[PDB]
Amino acid sequence: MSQVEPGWHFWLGYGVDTAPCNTPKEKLPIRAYPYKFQPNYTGTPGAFVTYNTLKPKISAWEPVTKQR
Amino acid sequence: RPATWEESEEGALSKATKYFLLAEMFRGLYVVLEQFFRAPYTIYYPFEKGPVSPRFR
Numbered sequence: 001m002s003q004v005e006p007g008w009h010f011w012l013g014y015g016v017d018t019a020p021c022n023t024p025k026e027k028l029p030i031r032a033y034p035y036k037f038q039p040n041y042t043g044t045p046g047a048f049v050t051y052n053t054l055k056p057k058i059s060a061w062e063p064v065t066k067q068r
Numbered sequence: 069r070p071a072t073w074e075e076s077e078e079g080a081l082s083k084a085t086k087y088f089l090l091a092e093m094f095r096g097l098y099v100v101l102e103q104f105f106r107a108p109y110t111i112y113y114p115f116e117k118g119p120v121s122p123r124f125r
């Protein structure tokens with residue numbers, strides 16, 4: 001079921017009367033990026049790997065010696 | 069006041085007929101059998117999909 005593209009997913013569930021290919025231009029989303037459809041990759045090497053998008057809150061000193 | 073047996077409209081033979089021949093049980097079986105000839109409700113997920121609304125979360 002995750003292979004069904006968004007829009008068609010809504011139509012198949014009787015969300016909208018008119019199908020995506022029949023939807024006028026004014027009611028389509030404008031994108032400034034390329035559109036790519038990807039299904040559920042769970043149980044597969046392509047499964048989502050989560051991570052922290054922040055570097056650590058406290059930064060340590062870079063140790064530097066000085067001569068007396 | 070609850071009525072006694074002697075003040076019953078139905079004769080004992082009609083009551084015994086209902087008792088031994090399971091009249092209401094047969095009515096129930098017939099009601100079940102009528103369903104057997106009606107359209108079922110099942111949909112073939114994931115080839116078909118149940119209703120979804122714009123507010124769905």
Ligand SMILES: CCCCCCCCCCCCCCCCCC(=O)OC[C@H](COP(=O)(O)OCCN)OC(=O)CCCCCCCCCCCCCCCCC
Nearest residue numbers: 080081082083084085086087088089090091093094097098
């Ligand atoms: C009029 C003169 C008659 C002369 C004599 C009669 C000749 C024999 C008649 C043949 C049938 C006799 C066998 C059935 C008698 C059932 C009597 C009965 O109702 O049993 C009741 C019993 C509880 O006992 P009781 O105290 O007497 O009830 C008072 C409740 N306040 O509680 C019970 O056991 C409930 C009844 C049991 C029903 C069993 C159901 C299992 C499957 C049902 C089969 C239906 C047919 C299936 C085939 C599909 C249809 C094509």
